[PDB]
Amino acid sequence: ATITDPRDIILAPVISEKSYGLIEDNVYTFVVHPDSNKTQIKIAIEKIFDVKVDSVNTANRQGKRKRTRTGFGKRKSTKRAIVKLAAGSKPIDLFGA
Amino acid sequence: SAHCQVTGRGPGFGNSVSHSHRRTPRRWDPNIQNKTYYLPSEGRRIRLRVSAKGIKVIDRDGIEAVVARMRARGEKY
Amino acid sequence: GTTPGELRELTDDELKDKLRESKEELFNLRFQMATGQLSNNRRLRTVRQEIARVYTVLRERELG
RNA sequence: CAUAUAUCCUGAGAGGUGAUGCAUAGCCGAGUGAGGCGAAUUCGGUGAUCCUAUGCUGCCGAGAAAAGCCUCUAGCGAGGAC
RNA sequence: UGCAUCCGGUGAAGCCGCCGAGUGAUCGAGUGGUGGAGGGUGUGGGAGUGAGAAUGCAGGCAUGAGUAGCGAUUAGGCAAGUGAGAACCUUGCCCGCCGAAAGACCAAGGGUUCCUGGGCCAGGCCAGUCCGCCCAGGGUGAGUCGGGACCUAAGGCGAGGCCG
RNA sequence: GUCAACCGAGCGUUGAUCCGAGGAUGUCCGAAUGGGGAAACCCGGCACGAGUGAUGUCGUGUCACCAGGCGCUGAAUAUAUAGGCGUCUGGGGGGAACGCGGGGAAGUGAAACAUCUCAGUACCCGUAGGAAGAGAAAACAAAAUGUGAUUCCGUGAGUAGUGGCGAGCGAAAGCGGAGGAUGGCUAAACCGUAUGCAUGUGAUACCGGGUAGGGGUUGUGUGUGCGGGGUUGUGGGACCUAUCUUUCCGGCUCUACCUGGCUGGAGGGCAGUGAGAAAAUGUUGUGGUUAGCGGAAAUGGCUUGGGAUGGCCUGCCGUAGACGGUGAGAGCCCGGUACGUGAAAACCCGACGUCUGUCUUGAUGGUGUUCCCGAGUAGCAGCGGGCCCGUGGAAUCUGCUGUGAAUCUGCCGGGACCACCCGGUAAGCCUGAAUACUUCCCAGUGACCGAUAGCGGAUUAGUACCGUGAGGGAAUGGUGAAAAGUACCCCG
């Protein structure tokens, strides 16, 4: 059978100064699957964490293009999603900073 | 052409002539026409692309017969 | 740590229980891996395999 | 029945709010750059190739379509409309 | 290469040679240096079988030559700075240039060139601590913006269809 | 996994890594197929299910096009049809060559050139198959008492011949061979049938005579679909009609009775996945392929050398001295060979028993006459193709038009044509084996190359780079036995 799990969409966190400046004021950035969307991500998150999302965003990133003895390779695109948890305000513990 | 329908008398490709030759074809078409007919069985008028030869065939053989023979070939009549 | 004959004792709903559990584990592992709070990398492989086994058993039971 | 500045429509802009805010001249030490308080804020001229203007006037070369908006019924019609 | 025999890590070939030979193409089983694994001889067989020239092909290197140039008609300078190393890099005060553009914002197009940290054997028409150069990491957030989910013109594709 | 190391963290005798066969999953584009589209990215419908306080969202499926069959309706319009709706099965595109049918050039040669040749080649089209196509005499031949399906090879033959008788092209018969299946199935006359367009002797006829009820097995017509009978050349066949007449019965010949002729079952025989009808079945062969495995004999002695696999001297194995590697030429070190082994599963061969039919209700011959022996065809004329054959006296084979016949004293051919003799019986269909070919796969061989060679590509290779685009299209192999890859110091 096939079982829709929400935890197969959300792949991973983001770890960087921008992300931490966002966390200081309760905004969390995750890495998702490219064919996702905002309703799907909202549902995944306010299911997984039983916490009250109010607005979601996105972005795309065209991967870099490095060189080699062989030649011109290219990393992978992604989709970064950015969530602003509402006044509920239980931070995401499993993040681990 | 739309191609004959009762026999299959397709074209042919000639060539040269007299007075010294020159090599050069000129399709030898067949003589198809657009005669129509009437099927008393199913109460209908049918139009076909049939040579005069095939008309000869009809009038000494019938039309039912011919449409059955064409049904065999499964022409999209 | 499981095997197919061990799992084939389990009925469907038990398999789905373990399935959802293992996906939760894989998720928490990916966060740990990003954070750097992980060392035993290979658990990712092991979990991924176990999920495959479980779907495989389900499909066996659906084509039998 | 009608010629009224009637009535309606459309419509640049002036005015009030928007704005107890923002922000700004500057001052203070401060030195990477952090910062914090922060006055008056009226009056006239000039003048757009911009706005009313898809307007107006004139001419001949006589000047896209469809969706959208409004409307009349066909019909779905006992439930719902604001 | 067929066949028979000889030398060879106690140093073959190949290369640089010296001394010598043959009437000539050429030869040294004559010896030295380098070097590191296959070669010679006689008889026959078979040839991708001998290059100095094709405004011949491929690679490398010369003469010209340490010569011409170093990419506009705006014009650079002094002190201090870090640095191994400064005409050019950072800052200070001057100076000068464009100012319906050599200024600020979009579309096409390109694709990380953007920021930070480090770097300077390659590149920049000099050098370079510098750079759109090199490496790693980071970075692009839309109910209302430009498009799609709304519509159609030129034109295209074109069920069926007609012709061939 | 690897170029390709480094680091980290692990697994494994409870059998890992690895190899083989089958399955499962199988994002998006692509014939691409829900609609659309700038290929790999945008929007949806329907049924179900998950999910929210409801919407949004999510998951599983399915929805294109035509051809055919079946089913419902039958628009103008009356019959009724095209069409419309639903369901079921097919096809759709890719491929390296090889094939068959069709189309179809030119530079060249002719010392020019058009006819000719190059070539019916290249190329294009439509369709295939594991091979294809052709194929059972309307053939050859020459009076020999001959041959006997076809195809592919050798020769005949660079001949007879053809040809602006110029360049040049160019058979066949016959003979020797490979392979053998000197192969089978149909239509028509004639009956029995369902029918379907028509009619009405409305009766002395539908049948075996005859004894006969009916009063039509419709009475007579006519094509259709089914079943019998019939497959030939020295002609055969269907009617006719004697003779021997190689199983039992059930009912049928309209009908009870004598026969003739059907419709059933039964022992049986024959054959079978055959070209000659077609599906699956289960046994099944140490039969074959798809992983592999064992496998004989020297740490031998002296010397050289960094290392002995060398030289010299001693032994051995050998159904194994092929090859390669190992620190320098290794039968006795390693890998492996000669040789023998090995398959749970899948696949292929036959083998079987199922299963399926099929003849059995039968045949050999007699005998005198009517009927049938594949029709818009063969033939003739007009333009043309290709056959050695360029319109020539030009047969045979053929394409389009126009005209257009007979059924055995019939018809077609034996290089115009006519008479005689000879051979053969067209216009319906299938047919293996010999033959051609290699994208891929497996194992080997080489008086083939050995990094400017050999496939363009030993090195990231159809890559980089060039071009808008189709399309072009490169360069670069070697440390040494093993990285022991120069720790440490000095100048910078």
Swiss-Prot record, chain A:
GO terms for cellular component: ribonucleoprotein complex; ribosome. The keyword rRNA-binding applies. Coiled coil: none annotated. The keyword rRNA-binding applies. Gene3D superfamilies: 3.30.70.330. It comes from the Bacteria. One of its GO terms (molecular function) is rRNA binding. Keywords: Ribonucleoprotein, Ribosomal protein, RNA-binding, rRNA-binding. It holds the Pfam family Ribosomal_L23. SUPFAM superfamilies: Ribosomal proteins S24e, L23 and L15e. One of the early assembly proteins it binds 23S rRNA. One of the proteins that surrounds the polypeptide exit tunnel on the outside of the ribosome. Forms the main docking site for trigger factor binding to the ribosome. Belongs to the universal ribosomal protein uL23 family. Part of the 50S ribosomal subunit. Contacts protein L29, and trigger factor when it is bound to the ribosome. This is Large ribosomal subunit protein uL23. It comes from Mycolicibacterium smegmatis (strain ATCC 700084 / mc(2)155). The lineage of its organism: Bacteria, Bacillati, Actinomycetota, Actinomycetes, Mycobacteriales.
Curated annotation (Swiss-Prot), chain C:
One of its GO terms (molecular function) is structural constituent of ribosome. One of its GO terms (biological process) is translation. Disulfide bonds: none annotated. Keywords: Ribonucleoprotein, Ribosomal protein. One of its GO terms (cellular component) is cytosolic large ribosomal subunit. It comes from the Bacteria. The keyword Transmembrane helix does not apply. Signal peptide: none annotated. Belongs to the universal ribosomal protein uL29 family. This is Large ribosomal subunit protein uL29.
